[PDB]
């Protein structure tokens, strides 16, 4: 047949071990580029001047890091939101000094990950499935956009993007608390409800279904062999589970409709994590957590401290110490 | 299709009100984030120069100029963290700018009282504040009732733009499924995967 | 999509029990250590290098500076029984802030 | 970097001992009559 037609058939084929698809055509090169650059940088990149003050921070293993302390360090504050590809540098040496790898990695990743979401829609369509798995994945994806793109945009610099490393993540979190009081922000609080609740409901669902598996095996064998891949019948007794959980709380707190149950399992952490992402994305424009500093005042006017004020003291310590050489003027305005 | 378009527009509007001070005049909406940061550098440049500081030759702790430095392409710009905001342009600042960036002669001789006033106003009305409208950084004590219209408009429209992207995906996925005839689930009698070769 | 998938429904649901239950148990263990101040506070190699080499900086050393800020600034009010009085001059602070 | 001199053997044995335990169990399962 036609060459283009045959290529299109291969790309969109439901028979490839890993689905390619049209989103995959962008996803594959961008994720490979992000991955390869990340690995090389994490191992071998020299120190990077993250805060634009000629104070280069070592991120790579060969330059004295371990797994926990290592990072791909964000691009220089001197660059800000400027696009800094390799060809904008006079040399690779300059590019490395200024945090070029970070921009390359995060842009390819965010593109690749957006296509990952689209690819998820795409295969669902090819297989005759319902389409919304990609909608659930939009919660972690949005969260990645929040910390790698949206927050830098709002703050005016990719140097304020989340670092690509374990201790760098903690740095980002602590500074974020100092500057936004994220803990006192209801979107982050909804985020915590999402992930605590998601983990809770994960353990709950797992324990309840596991609790009511139909006896199909002997004592000297795993219960997992009692289910066979693709069997028509259900492997557990949902009436039994419901009977248990309905008596644990009360009858009407327990789901007897599996479709309702599984929708709830999807929705709770997805919605919660959406709010988490929107927390970061709105604090990006400095609409910050609740501020109750000196809210409680006695008859004379003496400040009566609350736990909010104790948080404020910790926030202060973080604030005064962070990027100890970068501030010349009294207010940290971005 | 329309949800996808409105999402895109929402994200654009967010960036417009955050960065643009032409169709979103700072006189009405307040200074932008970049603007207020630049205004602080300007404020302390003025104060310290009035005290006798040679702001051009003042080396900061890092080695970079305390008040003035170069951008990565050489233009003279404000120092400190606001190095990131050197793309900022504003009517109160531009009289000080020449072909090479900020002009040291103009800085020494030509800064008017209205420029000092504006810089101080914008520095102290930076778009930072809490959800309960306490102005300033997160560690500020209660006193000033202020959140910028720029923050209100940026945050709201990011939220709306985001959920509209979710809406786009929801309805785009459903429209495809419904048109192909499987939005209600898989046909038990004709399950497509069952007719496909196994992957391995 | 992902390269791997569940094929056993029973394993799937057990794993869903296993993951968060095991996670919380692990965190409990770490808190037991913190009861005794038996922390993962430092990496000794990092500290030896940094002490000798004032140009060596990592995200680990950066975070310790933040911890030192937290301690000095929160302790007087957070631990009032200690009657801490930290004269302003002793408080750790970076430039300007 | 002046790392602990037992870190290498600690890590190597941490990896090898249980991995070997699993490898032993897997291979003897495969070799059983089907």
């Amino acid at each position: 047949a036609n060459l283009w037609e045959r290529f299109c058939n291969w790309v969109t084929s439901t028979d490839n071990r890993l689905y390619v698809g049209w989103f995959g055509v962008i996803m594959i090169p961008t994720l490979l580029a992000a991955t390869i650059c990340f690995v090389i940088a994490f191992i071998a990149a020299p120190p990077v001047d993250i805060d634009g003050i000629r104070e280069p921070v070592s991120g790579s293993l060969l330059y004295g890091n371990n797994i926990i302390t290592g990072a791909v360090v964000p691009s220089s504050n001197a660059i800000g939101l400027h696009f800094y590809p390799i060809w904008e540098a006079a040399s690779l040496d300059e590019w490395l000094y200024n945090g070029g790898p970070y921009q390359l990695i995060i842009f390819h990743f965010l593109l690749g990950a957006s296509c990952y979401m689209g690819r998820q829609w795409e295969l669902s369509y090819r297989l005759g499935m319902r389409p919304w798995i990609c909608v659930a994945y939009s919660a972690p994806l949005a969260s990645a956009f929040a910390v790698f793109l949206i927050y830098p945009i709002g703050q005016g610099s990719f140097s304020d993007g989340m670092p690509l490393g374990i201790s760098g993540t903690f740095n980002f979190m602590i500074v974020f608390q100092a500057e936004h009081n994220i803990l006192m922000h209801p979107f982050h609080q909804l985020g915590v409800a999402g992930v605590f609740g998601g983990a809770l409901f994960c353990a709950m669902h797992g324990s309840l279904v596991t609790s009511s598996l139909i006896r199909e095996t002997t004592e000297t064998e795993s219960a997992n062999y009692g289910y066979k891949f693709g069997q028509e019948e259900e492997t557990y007794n949902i009436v039994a589970a419901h009977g248990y959980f309905g008596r644990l709380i009360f009858q009407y707190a327990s789901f007897n409709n599996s479709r309702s149950l599984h929708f709830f399992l999807a929705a709770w952490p997805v919605v919660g994590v959406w709010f988490a992402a929107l927390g970061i994305s709105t604090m990006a424009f400095n609409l910050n957590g609740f501020n109750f500093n000196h809210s409680v005042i006695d008859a004379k006017g003496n400040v009566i401290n609350t736990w909010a004020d104790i948080i404020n003291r910790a926030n202060l310590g973080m604030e005064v110490m962070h990027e100890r050489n970068a501030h010349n003027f009294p207010l940290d305005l971005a | 299709y329309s949800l996808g378009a409105l999402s895109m527009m929402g994200f654009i509007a967010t960036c417009f009100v955050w960065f643009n001070n032409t169709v979103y005049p700072s006189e009405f909406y307040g200074p932008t984030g970049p603007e207020a940061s630049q205004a602080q550098a300007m404020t302390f440049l003025i104060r310290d120069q009035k005290l006798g500081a040679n702001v051009g030759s003042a080396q900061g702790p890092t080695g970079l100029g305390k008040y003035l430095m170069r951008s990565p392409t050489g233009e003279i710009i404000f120092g400190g963290e606001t190095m990131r905001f050197w793309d900022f342009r504003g009517p109160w600042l531009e009289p000080l700018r020449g072909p090479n960036g900020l002009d040291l002669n103009k800085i020494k001789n030509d800064i008017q009282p209205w420029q000092e006033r504006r810089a101080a106003e914008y520095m102290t009305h930076a778009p930072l504040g809490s959800l309960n409208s306490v102005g300033g950084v997160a560690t500020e004590i209660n006193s000033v009732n202020f959140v910028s219209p720029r923050s209100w408009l940026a945050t709201s429209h990011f939220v709306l733009a985001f959920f509209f992207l979710v809406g786009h995906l929801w309805h785009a996925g459903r429209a495809r499924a419904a048109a192909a005839g499987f939005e209600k689930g898989i046909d038990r009698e004709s399950e497509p995967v069952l007719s496909m070769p196994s992957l391995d | 999509i992902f390269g791997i998938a569940f094929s056993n429904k029973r394993w799937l649901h057990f794993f869903m029990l296993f993951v968060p239950v095991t996670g919380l148990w692990m965190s409990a263990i770490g808190v037991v250590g913190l009861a005794l101040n038996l922390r993962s506070y430092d990496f000794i190699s990092q500290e030896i290098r940094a002490a000798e080499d004032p140009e060596f900086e990592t995200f680990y050393t950066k975070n310790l500076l933040l911890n030192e800020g937290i301690r000095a600034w929160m302790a007087p009010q957070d631990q009032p029984h200690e009657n801490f009085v930290f004269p302003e001059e002793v408080l750790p602070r970076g430039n300007a802030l | 970097m002046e790392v602990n001199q037992l870190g290498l053997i600690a890590t190597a044995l941490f990896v090898l001992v249980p991995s070997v335990f699993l490898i032993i169990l897997y291979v003897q399962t495969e070799s059983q009559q089907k």
């Binding site: 293993l61 891949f229 | - | - | 990896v15």
Partner: peptide
């Protein structure tokens, strides 16, 4: 030596991903 150790463990993991995907036990309908 540490760096070698970290890179080694990482490389073993990526190798494991490969075998776990391409040399998995094939799911079968009985």
């Amino acid at each position: 030596m540490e760096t070698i150790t970290y890179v080694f463990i990482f490389a073993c993991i990526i190798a494991l991903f490969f075998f776990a995907i391409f040399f998995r036990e094939p799911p079968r309908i009985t």
